[PDB]
Amino acid sequence: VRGSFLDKSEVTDRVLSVVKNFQKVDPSKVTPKANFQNDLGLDSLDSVEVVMALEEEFGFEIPDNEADKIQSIDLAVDFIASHPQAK
Amino acid sequence: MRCLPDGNLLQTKIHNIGATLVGVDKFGNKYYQKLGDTQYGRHRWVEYASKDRYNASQVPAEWHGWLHFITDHTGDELLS
Amino acid sequence: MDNQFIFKYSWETLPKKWVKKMERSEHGNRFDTNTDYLFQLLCFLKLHTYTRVQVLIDICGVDYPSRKRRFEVVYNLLSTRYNSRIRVQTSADEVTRISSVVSLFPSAGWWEREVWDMFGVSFINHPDLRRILTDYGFEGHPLRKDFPLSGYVQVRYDDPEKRVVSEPIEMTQEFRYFDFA
Amino acid sequence: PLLQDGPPPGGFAPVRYARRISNTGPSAMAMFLAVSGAFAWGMYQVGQGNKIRR
Amino acid sequence: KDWNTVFERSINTLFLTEMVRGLSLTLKYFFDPKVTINYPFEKGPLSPRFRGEHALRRYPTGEERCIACKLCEAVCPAQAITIEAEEREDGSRRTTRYDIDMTKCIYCGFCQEACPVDAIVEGPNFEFATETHEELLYDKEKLLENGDRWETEIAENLRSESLYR
Amino acid sequence: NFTLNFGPQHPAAHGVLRLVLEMNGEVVERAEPHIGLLHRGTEKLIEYKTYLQALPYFDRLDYVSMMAQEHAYSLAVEKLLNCEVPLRAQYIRVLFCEITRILNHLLALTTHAMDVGALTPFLWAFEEREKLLEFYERVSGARMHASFIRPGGVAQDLPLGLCRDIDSFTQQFASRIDELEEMLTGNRIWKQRLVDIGTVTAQQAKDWGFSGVMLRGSGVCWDLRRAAPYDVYDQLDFDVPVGTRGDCYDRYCIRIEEMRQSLRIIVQCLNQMPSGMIKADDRKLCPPSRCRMKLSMESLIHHFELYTEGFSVPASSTYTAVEAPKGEFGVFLVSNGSNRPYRCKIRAPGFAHLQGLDFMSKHHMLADVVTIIGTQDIVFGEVDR
Amino acid sequence: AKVKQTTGIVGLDVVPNARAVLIDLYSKTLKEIQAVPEDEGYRKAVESFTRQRLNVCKEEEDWEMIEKRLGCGQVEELIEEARDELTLIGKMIEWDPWGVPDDYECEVIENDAPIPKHVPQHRPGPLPEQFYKTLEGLIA
Amino acid sequence: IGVPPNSANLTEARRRVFDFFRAACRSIPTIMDIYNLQDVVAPSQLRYAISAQIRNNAHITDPKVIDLLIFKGMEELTDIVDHAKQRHHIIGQYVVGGKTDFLKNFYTSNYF
C-alpha cells in the first residue's frame, strides 16, 4: 500500500513542539488554536521564523501566498496535512 | 673527456676553433674572440678555468664589461 | 564641431532643469547635472542629431570627504561623428542609488560594477551589480579616502588547516608617510 | 656635448615597408598533366610487373 | 565564371599548392645559422646604462661617498631604502644603517639619479639569485662589498655616461 | 546547460585568464570572464606617490606596451602644467611609441598563432622583439620598464650610434613581416581558424566602447593619432587601415598592416630627428644636469626639491587619451594643488574589449574562444590595474 | 545614379531607396515635433535642420548629390540619425522636461587656462554651413 | 534581477527585509553541506545568527540605509554559497560552533 499525506494527528504535535521549542514561547500559551502574533507575544520577524521552521521540519517549501495564511497553529496544521510533498 | 657528458662545454670548444686569445684573468678563465659576423658580429666568449662546476658569477668585474659588450676595453686594459 | 559650438548649442537646446553647471575650458567641456536627470541627459546626447555622443569612454568615482555628497561620478563620453569629447558629472552619497546607463551604453556594465566595488555607489536597474575587482568576501571600498592603503586583512597558507586563510594584517615595516608640504 | 645622435648627411637609405610579392609555382595544367601522365604510364607498368610476377 | 578559372581554383585546392610554400620557407631556416647564445660561456649585449644590483661606492681614499642626505630614501617609489645616520666620531655626517630590500625594489634607478655624490649606483651585475629571502635584504656592509667588487666596471661606466647626464 | 570552468593558467593563454562558459555540446552560449586576479590596487597606490614616483606604475599596466602608457601619463601632467616639450623630445617620444607598437603587435600576433597551433612564427618574431628590446635598454638601462618618457620630455638623450642601429633594423624589418605573412595570410588552415570568427558590427563596436583595431576592424576610420594628434604625429605620413568584415581575419591583417605603417613612421622620425634639448627648459619641473647641480646653488636647490618634494600641479581635472597599441588608453587625472595626484582613474582598452567577449563568442565553437581572446589582445595588468 | 554596392561600414546595409526613406522620416519628424512647446530650443533646432535636410532631399534626385550637398556622411548614416531623432522625440514628449523652474540657477565657468600645442587635442574643422545657421537661428 | 529603486517607506523596506531573511534561511542546508557543519553547529543556530544580525539593526529609521544593508547582506550570502572561503570555526564573519574586564585588559596590554 502507498500514501501521499502525513496523518493530521501526526502533524499537530509536530507543529506543537516546534513552537514550544522556539524561544520567546512559554509552553503554557500554546493551545492548538493560538495566534503567533496576538497570543504568543511574537513580532512579525518572529512569526516569519516559525513558518521557516515548519518548512524545514516537513522538508517542503511554502509559497509567500500561503506563508502569510499560516498566522495560527490550526492553520499551519491543515496546510501540511493536505499538502502531498510533506514527508 | 668532459665534452662527452657536458655538451655546453663542447659547443664552446668547437666555437673556439679558429678563435683568438684575448687574455686570461686571475682565476684562470680564458677569453676568446673571432671577429666575424654570425650573431651580428658578437663573438666574445669565456672558457672557464674549471671544466666542471663553472658558474657565471666567476667572471671578474674587469672582464664582465667586455664579455657583455658594455665596453671595448679588455680586463687587462681596465686593470692598467 | 569645436567646444565653442557644443557649449553654445547645448545651452540653447537642452531643457534648462537638467544642467546646473556648465564649464567651458581647454581641460574639457563639463556638464554637471542632478542624479535624477543623468539618464535623460545621456539619452538626449546620444540620440540628438547635432551631438551624436555614441561612445561611453568610462565611468569613474571620486571621493570628497569634506562634502555632504562625498562621491562624484564622472561620465567621459565621445562623439566619433563630430570628433569631440564631453564630460558629464553628478554627485552622490553613501546611500543614494543613482540610475544605471547600461540600457544606453552596454559598456557601462563593468564600469558601474567597478564603481560599486571601489566606492560603494549603487546603480538602479543594473542587471548584475556585484564586485568585480576585489577578492570574494571583501569588506569595505578601497578607493574611499578613509580606507587604509594596506587594508585590514592579509592571506597566508596555514598548514594545520591545509588552506590559504585570511587574518588581520601585521606589517613587518610600516608604510612611511613622507609629508613634504 | 654638441654632438648628438642623428641622421648622416643626406639621410639614411630608403627602406621598403610594402609586401614584396613572389611568383613561385608551376600551378594549373603542369601539375594536373604530370599527375595524369604518371597515373596512366605507372598503371601500365603495374600491368607489366604483374605479368612478370605471374 | 569560367571553366579555366574554375579549373585552376579546383587544382589549387586539391593539390595544396599554398601549403607547399609554407613548407619551403620553413625549410630555408633549417640550414641557416642559429641565434642561440651559449650561456654562460657567451653573454647577451648590455649597455653602460644597465640597471642591475645596487652598490655603495667609496672615494679613492677609502672614505664612503654617502653623506646620509636621505634623498634616495625619499624618492624611492617602492620604499625599499631604510637609512639611519648620526655624527661620526670625527664629526663626519655618515650613515649607521643603509638597507635596501631587494624584494621591494623595482630597479628603477631613481635612487642613483637622486644621489648628489654618486654614492648609490645600480651596477651592471644581474646574476645574483639566492636561495633565501633574507639574503636579498642588503645591509650597508653588503652594499659596500658590492661597490668594492664592481668598482672598476662602475667607474668606467660613469665616465662613459657622464656626457649624457 | 552544463558549465565549463576553463582558466588558461600559463603563458599559453594570458595566465590569470579565468572563464565560465555555458555550453550546448561544443557550441558556446554565454561567456563570463572573472577578473581581479591581477588587481593590485594601482589606482589607490598612485594617490600615495608624488607625480614622479607614480610614473613607473604606468609601465606595469599594459606590460607589453610600456612606453605608450608612460607617454599618456606624461601628456596628462604636461596638459595640467601647461608645459612645453622640446621638438627633439617629441620626435624621440613618437619614435619609441611606434617601436612599442611593433613590440606589441609582434607578441599579440605570434602568441595568438601559437595558441591555434602555429608554433614557428612566435620564435621568429621574438628574435625581432629582442632587437627592439635592446633599443629600450640602450636609452634607459632597462629592457622593459624603461621609465624613459617623463613629464617635460625624456629622461636622457640617445647614446651615440643608436639611430644608425635603428636604421639597420628598419632596413630588414619588412622582410621579417613578409615571412610572418607568408606563414599565415595565405594558408587555408589559418583562414579557416579566423574568417567570420568574432564578427563585430560598427554599432556594436561603439556600443561596447571598442577602440583601436577592435574598432577599425568594423570599418570605422578612427585613429587618435589623426583625430586628436599629439607630439609630432601631424608632421608624419601614415595610413590608417580599416576592415571590411569585422571578423578575426581583418583584425589580423590590420595589425600586420599597422606594423608596416609603424615601420614607415620610424623611418621618418629617424630622418627628421632634430638637434636640441630633450627636456623642457623650465627650472621648476626638470632635473638639472649633474655638473650644474654640483656647481650652482640654484641648481642644487632645485635638485633637492625635485627629488624630495616633487613638483606641484595646480588644482584641476582632465581626461587625456592616446592611441596605445591595444586601443585608446586614457588617464583621468584630478589635481588638488599638491605634489601627489588626488585621483588617477586609468581607462584601459582591454577592460572594454574583454567585456565584449560575451557577445563576440556567442554561438561559436569552444575552440574559437581562444581565437577571439587573441584578436582582442588582452593583458590583465591593464584590465585589473 | 549608380547603385551603391557597399557603405564600407560593417553592419550598415545599403539602402537603395534612401531618398524616399529620408523624405518620409523628415516629414514624420516635422509633425511629431509639434507636440513640443513652440518656445523650446529643442523644437526650434530640430525643425531648423530637419527642414534644410528635407529641402535638399526633395530637390536632389541622386543620392550622391544629397550626400555631397549635406556633407553629413552617407545617406545610410543620415537615415540612422533621422530614425534616432524620431526616437528621441518620443522620449522627450513622455519625459516632459520643458519649462524653466521657479528658483532656477545655473553657474557658468569659462576657464581660460591654456594647454600646450603638443598634448592631444580634437580639431575636427568647420561644420557644414547649416550647423552655424541653426545655432545663430537659435541665438536670435 | 536589476537593482530595484530605493524603498519608498518602512513597509516596502520591511517586505524586502523579510524577503532577504527568507532567502538567507533557505540557503542554510546548502551552507551546511559546503562547510561540513553536521557535527559543528545546528541549523537553527545559523538561523539565530541571521535573525540576530537583523535585530541589532532594528533602530534604523531610514529606508535608504535598510536597502543598503539588505544589498550588502545579499552580496555576503552569495559569496558564502558560491565562493566559500573555508575556515574552521568561521563562516564569512560569523564565529560558528571573578575579576572585571579591566584587570584582564590591564594584564593583557596597555592599549584597551
Ligand SMILES: CCCCCCCCCCCC(=O)SCCNC(=O)CCNC(=O)[C@H](O)C(C)(C)COP(=O)(O)O
Ligand atoms: C549566512 C549569513 C549571510 C547573510 C547575513 C547577512 C547579514 C544580515 C543582516 C542584514 C539585514 C539588516 O540588518 S536590514 C535592517 C533590518 N531592520 C529594519 O528593518 C529596521 C527597522 N526595524 C523593523 O522594521 C523591525 O524592528 C523588525 C524587527 C526588523 C521587524 O519589525 P517588527 O518589530 O514588527 O517585527
Ligand code: SF4
Ligand atoms: S632601484 Fe628604484 S626602487 Fe630600487 S632602491 Fe633604487 S630607487 Fe628604490
Ligand code: SF4
Ligand atoms: S646614497 Fe646618496 S642619496 Fe642616498 S643618503 Fe647617501 S648620499 Fe644621500
